[PDB]
Amino acid sequence: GIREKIKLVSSAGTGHFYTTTKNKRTKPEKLELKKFDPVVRQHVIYKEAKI
Amino acid sequence: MDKKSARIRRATRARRKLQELGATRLVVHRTPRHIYAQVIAPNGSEVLVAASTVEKAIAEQLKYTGNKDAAAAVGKAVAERALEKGIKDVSFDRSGFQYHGRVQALADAAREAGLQF
Amino acid sequence: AKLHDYYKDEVVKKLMTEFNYNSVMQVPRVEKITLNMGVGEAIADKKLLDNAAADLAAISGQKPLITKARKSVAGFKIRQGYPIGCKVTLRGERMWEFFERLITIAVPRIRDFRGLSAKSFDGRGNYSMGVREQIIFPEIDYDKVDRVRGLDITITTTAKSDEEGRALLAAFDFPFR
Amino acid sequence: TRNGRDSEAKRLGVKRFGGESVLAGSIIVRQRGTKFHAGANVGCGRDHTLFAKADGKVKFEVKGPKNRKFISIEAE
Amino acid sequence: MLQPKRTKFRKMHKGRNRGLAQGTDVSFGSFGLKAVGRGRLTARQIEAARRAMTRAVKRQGKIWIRVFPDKPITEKPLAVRMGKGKGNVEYWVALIQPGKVLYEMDGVPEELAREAFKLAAAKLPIKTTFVTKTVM
RNA sequence: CGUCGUAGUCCGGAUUGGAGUCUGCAACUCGACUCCAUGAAGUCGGAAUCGCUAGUAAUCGUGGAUCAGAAUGCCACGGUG
RNA sequence: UGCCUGGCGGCCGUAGCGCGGUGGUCCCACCUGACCCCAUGCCGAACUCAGAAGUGAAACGCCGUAGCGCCGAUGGUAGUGUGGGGUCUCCCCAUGCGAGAGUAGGGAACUGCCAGGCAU
RNA sequence: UCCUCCUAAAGAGUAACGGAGGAGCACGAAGGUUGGCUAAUCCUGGUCGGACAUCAGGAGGUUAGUGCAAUGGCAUAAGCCAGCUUGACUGCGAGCGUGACGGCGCGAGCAGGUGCGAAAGCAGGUCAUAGUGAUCCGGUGGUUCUGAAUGGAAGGGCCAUC
RNA sequence: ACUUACCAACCCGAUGCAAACUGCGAAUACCGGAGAAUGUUAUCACGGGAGACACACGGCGGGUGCUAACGUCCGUC
RNA sequence: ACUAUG
RNA sequence: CGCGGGGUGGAGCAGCUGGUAGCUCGUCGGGCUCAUAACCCGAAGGUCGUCGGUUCAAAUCCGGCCCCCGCAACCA
């Protein structure tokens, strides 16, 4: 359905991402989450991007 | 629903949890005039130590039986009886009473005297 | 202050001898006084409901809880959780200082006033009345009404029957027929 | 629309019965709701699958106000 | 013609018809028509038999009907190479076990009521008897 | 000469309530006029359509016949124009 | 040792719901007040704190009552495992198990640990 | 193809062009945690307000709710409302269940590092059961691997993902 | 405002029916443990070699059909 | 821009 | 029966993507004419076949019942 895929990308400049879904119409504003980067081995901010 | 039954309803989840853990629990029972406290065994029937603002050793000292400065005296008393009988680890059962003011002040006076929670 | 000190002295003793209660606790007490403004056309615009609130803010003297729609229902055209009214609940000091300024000034000042209807009790001892307009109260500065807007009162009481309700309110000098 | 359709059978039910001795981890009952609840040494999973947390013999019983069937355990 | 107003399900399994009846006593009236064998009353049968006994008393009396046709029954139409689903519901039946009371009468005498239930019995497919009420 | 200020108003007077006056054997059905109160419609009228060439149209009052009483009609009279 | 109350339990309607009676020295409840801790999508209603003038009315607890719930045999009936038989859509015989409903009847719970109060 | 009920004979499983219905998604909150709360419906009174809307009280006891079928659950709520947040974490996993196999499901507990809570604790998505697609080929990012004389690179691998 | 021989929700009493109703509930079967006797190890695991995957009727429990069929589709012997 | 009938 | 489509003011039609019913003719009232027709002006009128569901809400989504069309009903 109208429920597209997205990378969340780490703010430490490892190119580690999580991938997840988002409704683009009902929420336009960009998704920002703390999550565990396993390369540096810390919790870190992760921001939206294109899959 | 009167206040006593609603307070038990609040308490019940805490206590069912503390059964399956198998924990010794410091039950407290606040009243407008008084405040009570028991340490109850892992099985959940038999009591090990008690203190309260009725039992006369503690009542003699105090100004008034049902306020913060009473509760600090009772929380002091239960620790000093429990440490005699080899009881360090307990889990503080607030029994449907907000952790705050008088019940808070009981618990923080039991942490002072070194009863671990 | 005034009506509450009046209750403790004059009314308690007088309703003991009338009904023969045994303990002093059984005498009816005035629990609360609930206001209301069942707007219904804030579906039009929410500034009606602000003017509704700020009226009740003036009349009572404390901030009103705006109420949401419990259900949806079609004849009104309402979503569930549309703001469809406001209220205040008055107790303690702010009850009695309102309950004075009802009896004293703003019951006289109703137009075409032939008392208040004594069969408007609900069956276990609480009174309810409309007022057609808010201008009967002092603080509603007339020259500043955008619109005349009615209002309900509801005096809630610790009373068994409507008989003991009509005892208690009549014993404050509450103007009935 | 007409008929023709059913799902695949999900092989629920009790697996280990009372008396039967288990190893911690062993599932005891798969189930949709909580026909049975967890007592002593027993986990409710997330699909309400009930499993041993210790080795021992399974015990069923009834308990509490509502007469609910608890699976518990007697660690040997 | 008797037939429930609405049900849950249009169609029902065939089932069996074993065992003896509940509803053995004559409760409502003085007399009654107890079944002795075992089958199905259709709804047309139950009606045909009411119209016999009603005619026969000249409307004195009161009549109770104790059985209701609430099982539906399907038939396939003519030529239907089997399968292709279950048939349409043609008609309705009650199942009857040995001992069910079917009709009850009072407000007539035992002369007339014997003759009314004889005239009903000829419309029904199952063997029947006359019974009077027992005090316990 | 004063006053009202563009408002359904100190515009408009319909309608209804109350109390009267007069004529008349008699004002219920159904008279006119007065007083107090009430204060509708109506903000210049669609298609269409009428009258008038000078003391005319427009507008303002006055009188008469009929008639106990009952004229916004009818017949007549002058004013302004 | 007895009587009364509070807390934590075991037990899960023989234990509950109603109806009637009763308890305040302590206990408990309502109760008095609120600048402070804290609180209300408004409100000291609740939660909370500071208290102790009043009251057992409500609530709670205790006692009584078979009005409603609740439990409930014996016997018989239904069903059915194995073997056999029929008039074989359904039954019967030998044998083993044996309900549900109902009936008599029972029943106004029983029981533990700790604290406090009155009597002895 | 998948999910739910019945058929199915009180463990599991069990056919038919047998009887009934659903899915091919949604949600950064509708997830996590701490604290609090308890429904439908009907009756009585009350400005405009009517059978139906906000207010008060009483009866009632989940007849309600649970994002969506059905079933089983649910008051310690799994239902409803607030505060703070990202455990809708990474590495693993004793041991179970379920499949012919490919596979699918449950999982205490260990390590790293988070969130809520005073603490005991709880959290590896949602009350559970549908919401899906093997391999090949190719694409995008990363990498202590490889690199056809040697140094690079191209391509290949491994990890993430389309 | 008044009378009603008309339909009559809920509650009350008596009375039946249900595969997809259950405040009840067997017999059997199934899982587990202990104990004799008995059975040519009949259980399980690992290798070599298959065949077979059109079944039929009879009894019992059911679906479907008309409780039609030497009918059809499951279960168990 | 007009128009048909009795 | 197998498949599909359609029932809307009096007539023929549009609206069917849930929250809003339009178009041409006819009817009614007023004008023009000696009168009628044409022509000009003004006003109304639709249980959306029927029963029942779903939703807060149904012309509209979903089911049964009734009528009306169209296509198919073959190989022996």
From Swiss-Prot, chain A:
Part of the 50S ribosomal subunit. Cross-links to the P and E site tRNAs. Keywords: Methylation, Ribonucleoprotein, Ribosomal protein, RNA-binding, tRNA-binding. InterPro entries: Ribosomal_bL33, Ribosomal_bL33_CS, Ribosomal_bL33_sf, Ribosomal_zn-bd. It comes from Escherichia coli (strain K12). Surface exposed on the 50S subunit. GO terms for cellular component: cytoplasm; cytosol; cytosolic large ribosomal subunit. It comes from the Bacteria. Belongs to the bacterial ribosomal protein bL33 family. It holds the Pfam family Ribosomal_L33. The lineage of its organism: Bacteria, Pseudomonadati, Pseudomonadota, Gammaproteobacteria, Enterobacterales. GO terms for molecular function: structural constituent of ribosome; tRNA binding. PROSITE patterns: RIBOSOMAL_L33 (PS00582). This is Large ribosomal subunit protein bL33. NCBIfam families: PRK00595.1 (NF001860), rpmG_bact (TIGR01023). The gene is rpmG.
Curated annotation (Swiss-Prot), chain B:
Keywords: Phosphoprotein, Ribonucleoprotein, Ribosomal protein, RNA-binding, rRNA-binding. Gene3D superfamilies: 3.30.420.100. Pfam families: Ribosomal_L18p. One of its GO terms (molecular function) is structural constituent of ribosome. One of its GO terms (biological process) is cytoplasmic translation. The protein has been shown to contain a phosphoserine, which was required for the protein to bind to 5S rRNA. However, the presence of this phosphoserine is controversial, and it has not been seen by mass spectrometry. InterPro entries: Ribosomal_uL18_bac-type (IPR004389), Ribosomal_uL18_bac/euk (IPR005484). GO terms for cellular component: cytoplasm; cytosol; cytosolic large ribosomal subunit. Residues 1-17 are annotated as: Required for binding of the 5S rRNA/L5/L18 complex to the 23S rRNA. Belongs to the universal ribosomal protein uL18 family. This is one of the proteins that mediates the attachment of the 5S rRNA subcomplex onto the large ribosomal subunit where it forms part of the central protuberance. Binds stably to 5S rRNA; increases binding abilities of L5 in a cooperative fashion; both proteins together confer 23S rRNA binding. The 5S rRNA and some of its associated proteins might help stabilize positioning of ribosome-bound tRNAs. Part of the 50S ribosomal subunit; part of the 5S rRNA/L5/L18/L25 subcomplex. Contacts the 5S and 23S rRNAs. This is Large ribosomal subunit protein uL18.
Swiss-Prot record, chain C:
One of its GO terms (cellular component) is cytosolic large ribosomal subunit. The modification N6-acetyllysine is found at K2. SUPFAM superfamilies: RL5-like (SSF55282). The keyword RNA-binding applies. It comes from the Bacteria. Keywords: Acetylation, Ribonucleoprotein, Ribosomal protein, RNA-binding, rRNA-binding, tRNA-binding. One of its GO terms (biological process) is cytoplasmic translation. One of its GO terms (molecular function) is structural constituent of ribosome. The keyword Transferase does not apply. InterPro entries: Ribosomal_uL5, Ribosomal_uL5_bac-type, Ribosomal_uL5_C, Ribosomal_uL5_CS, Ribosomal_uL5_dom_sf, Ribosomal_uL5_N. Belongs to the universal ribosomal protein uL5 family. NCBIfam families: PRK00010.1. Part of the 50S ribosomal subunit; part of the 5S rRNA/L5/L18/L25 subcomplex. Contacts the 5S rRNA; cross-links to the P site tRNA. Forms a bridge to the 30S subunit in the 70S ribosome, contacting protein S13 and S19. Identified as a multicopy suppressor of the slow growth phenotype of an rsgA (yjeQ) deletion mutant. This is Large ribosomal subunit protein uL5. The lineage of its organism: Bacteria, Pseudomonadati, Pseudomonadota, Gammaproteobacteria, Enterobacterales.
From Swiss-Prot, chain D:
It comes from the Bacteria. Keywords: Ribonucleoprotein, Ribosomal protein, RNA-binding, rRNA-binding, tRNA-binding. GO terms for cellular component: cytoplasm; cytosolic large ribosomal subunit. GO terms for molecular function: ribosome binding; rRNA binding; structural constituent of ribosome; tRNA binding. InterPro entries: Ribosomal_bL27, Ribosomal_bL27_CS. GO terms for biological process: assembly of large subunit precursor of preribosome; cytoplasmic translation; cytosolic ribosome assembly; positive regulation of ribosome biogenesis; regulation of cell growth; ribosomal large subunit assembly. Part of the 50S ribosomal subunit. Cross-links to the 23S rRNA. Cross-links to the A and P site tRNAs. Belongs to the bacterial ribosomal protein bL27 family. This is Large ribosomal subunit protein bL27. The gene is rpmA.
